Amino acid sequence: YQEPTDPKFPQQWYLSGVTQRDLNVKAAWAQGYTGHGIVVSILDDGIEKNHPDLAGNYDPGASFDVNDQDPDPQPRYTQMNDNRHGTRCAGEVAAVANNGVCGVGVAYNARIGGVRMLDGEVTDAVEARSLGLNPNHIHIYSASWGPEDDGKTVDGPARLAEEAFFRGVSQGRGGLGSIFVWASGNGGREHDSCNCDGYTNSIYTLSISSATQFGNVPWYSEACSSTLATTYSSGNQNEKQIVTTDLRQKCTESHTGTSASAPLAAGIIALTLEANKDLTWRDMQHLVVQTSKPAHLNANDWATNGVGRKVSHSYGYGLLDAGAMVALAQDWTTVAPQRKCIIDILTEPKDIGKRLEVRKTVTACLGEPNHITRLEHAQARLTLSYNRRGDLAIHLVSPMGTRSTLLAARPHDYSADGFNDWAFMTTHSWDEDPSGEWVLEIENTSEANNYGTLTKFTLVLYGTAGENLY
Ligand SMILES: CN1CCN(c2ncc(Oc3cc(CN4CCC(CC(=O)O)CC4)cc(-c4cc(Cl)cc(Cl)c4)n3)cn2)CC1
Ligand SMILES: [Ca+2]
Numbered sequence: 001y002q003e004p005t006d007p008k009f010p011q012q013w014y015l016s017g018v019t020q021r022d023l024n025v026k027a028a029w030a031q032g033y034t035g036h037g038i039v040v041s042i043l044d045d046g047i048e049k050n051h052p053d054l055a056g057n058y059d060p061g062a063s064f065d066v067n068d069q070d071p072d073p074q075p076r077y078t079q080m081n082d083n084r085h086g087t088r089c090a091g092e093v094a095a096v097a098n099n100g101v102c103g104v105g106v107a108y109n110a111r112i113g114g115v116r117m118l119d120g121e122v123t124d125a126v127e128a129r130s131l132g133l134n135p136n137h138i139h140i141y142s143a144s145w146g147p148e149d150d151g152k153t154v155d156g157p158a159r160l161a162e163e164a165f166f167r168g169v170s171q172g173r174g175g176l177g178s179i180f181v182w183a184s185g186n187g188g189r190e191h192d193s194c195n196c197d198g199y200t201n202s203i204y205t206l207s208i209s210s211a212t213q214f215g216n217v218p219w220y221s222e223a224c225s226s227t228l229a230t231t232y233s234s235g236n237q238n239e240k241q242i243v244t245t246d247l248r249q250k251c252t253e254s255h256t257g258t259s260a261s262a263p264l265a266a267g268i269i270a271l272t273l274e275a276n277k278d279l280t281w282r283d284m285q286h287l288v289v290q291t292s293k294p295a296h297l298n299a300n301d302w303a304t305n306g307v308g309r310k311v312s313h314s315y316g317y318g319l320l321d322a323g324a325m326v327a328l329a330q331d332w333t334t335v336a337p338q339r340k341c342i343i344d345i346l347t348e349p350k351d352i353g354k355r356l357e358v359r360k361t362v363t364a365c366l367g368e369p370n371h372i373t374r375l376e377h378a379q380a381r382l383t384l385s386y387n388r389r390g391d392l393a394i395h396l397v398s399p400m401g402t403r404s405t406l407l408a409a410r411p412h413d414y415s416a417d418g419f420n421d422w423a424f425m426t427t428h429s430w431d432e433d434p435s436g437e438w439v440l441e442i443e444n445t446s447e448a449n450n451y452g453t454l455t456k457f458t459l460v461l462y463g464t465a466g467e468n469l470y
């Protein structure tokens with residue numbers, strides 16, 4: 001093994017660094033893990049398949065054009081370079097190494113393709129065809145975009161896309177499950193809260209946020225309990241950005257946003273799959289939880305959960321660590337079957353007013369085939385009316401004491417439409433025992449006299465049984 005010689009590798013500070021402020025990818029490469037045999041697809045505006053740093057790794061079997069309904073995902077060229085983003089993301093995953101061009105991908109021996117889906121009308125059918133592309137050939141899908149990041153939107157997949165996600169995790173990859181990597185959002189300036197985005201908020205997606213070079217929460221970041229982990233991206237004008245392939249056969253040093261973090265995670269996941277090709281979609285989320293690193297990430301909300309892990313709403317479990325992912329993958333025993341325990345909490349609607357607390361002691365399906373002693377995801381599916389939605393903050397506390405913020409105040413959200421059976425999701429209680437008293441808190445964070453009613457609260461627990469060793 002020799003370190004890459006590509007001319008811009010030194011500028012890929014999140015890979016080439018030697019000050020321990022990086023993704024620890026060199027450690028994985030040094031053990032011989034570079035993505036060989038793994039297939040990744042970028043869901044975006046197209047991929048410049050003839051780019052000098054992509055052609056060597058390009059895979060037509062990982063690619064399709066859902067906008068035009070043909071196999072060739074080549075983007076359209078315009079003066080504003082609108083359709084450059086899929087190419088930038090593709091190079092982050094799998095730019096060719098040691099070829100005198102630009103830098104390298106995280107998984108520089110993986111195969112890379114793209115779905116051209118964003119250069120046209122994005123419909124339920126378009127989303128389903130993209131998420132469901134060749135699921136026994138593609139291992140990992142990377143999506144950097146979704147519903148509007150205006151801080152006012154609540155939106156998620158419709159029926160066909162939801163079914164594609166479920167079919168992907170259940171039957172993709174020969175039954176191991178498609179791995180869907182998602183960017184948690186770019187709406188930080190607008191005070192967006194990412195559990196309002198049903199793609200990143202899904203249990204089926206492995207959601208990723210960003211850290212700046214100096215280890216801070218970037219201006220564009222969205223906090224939420226559904227995020228799992230973090231990779232480096234852009235920040236202020238003293239901090240470096242992401243260096244990758246660009247449209248028109250170029251190299252950029254100015255790729256930015258959480259949309260640049262998801263592809264780096266997809267690349268790390270490709271190295272991990274090469275290390276253990278038998279990992280399921282759930283195994284991969286377990287590995288991320290166990291191995292990600294809070295060290296040197298600054299946040300004001302780090303808290304230790306019931307099993308002793310530090311977690312943040314900006315960062316999830318912390319920075320991805322490629323060396324640690326590959327090491328744990330080699331020792332991992334695949335997890336037991338997923339159980340799902342549905343608990344109807346309310347006996348009657350509850351006035352919200354200024355503040356509401358709902359407490360319920362649960363058994364997590366004790367005595368039944370879906371009894372859960374080892375939690376993975378948890379959802380609170382809430383139906384509520386309120387006069388000004390963005391004034392609400394919502395928290396969920398587990399029996400072991402872990403407080404998850406399900407919704408922070410969104411000052412720009414003046415909707416009067418409330419939430420209709422919306423499944424706010426938290427990863428912060430992973431591995432906890434969910435038996436005991438849960439607490440839901442709903443608060444009006446404004447001085448206004450706001451009003452509404454909580455009409456349904458369904459607590460949904462996922463996980464496994466067996467002795468909980470935490
Ligand atoms: C510079 N770039 C310009 C283009 N851009 C962009 N981003 C995002 C974009 O809208 C969207 C919108 C959605 C939301 N959904 C909800 C259900 C609706 C059903 C219906 O009514 O039929 C249809 C719309 C989802 C997605 C999406 C994105 C990916 Cl990557 C993968 C999947 Cl699966 C879904 N995308 C449109 N353009 C990114 C920035
Ligand atoms: Ca085409």
Ligand SMILES: [Ca+2]
Binds near residue numbers: 053098102
């Ligand atoms: Ca290169």
Ligand SMILES: [Ca+2]
Binds near residue numbers: 184185192194197222
């Ligand atoms: Ca958002």
Ligand SMILES: [Ca+2]
Binds near residue numbers: 182
């Ligand atoms: Ca997710």
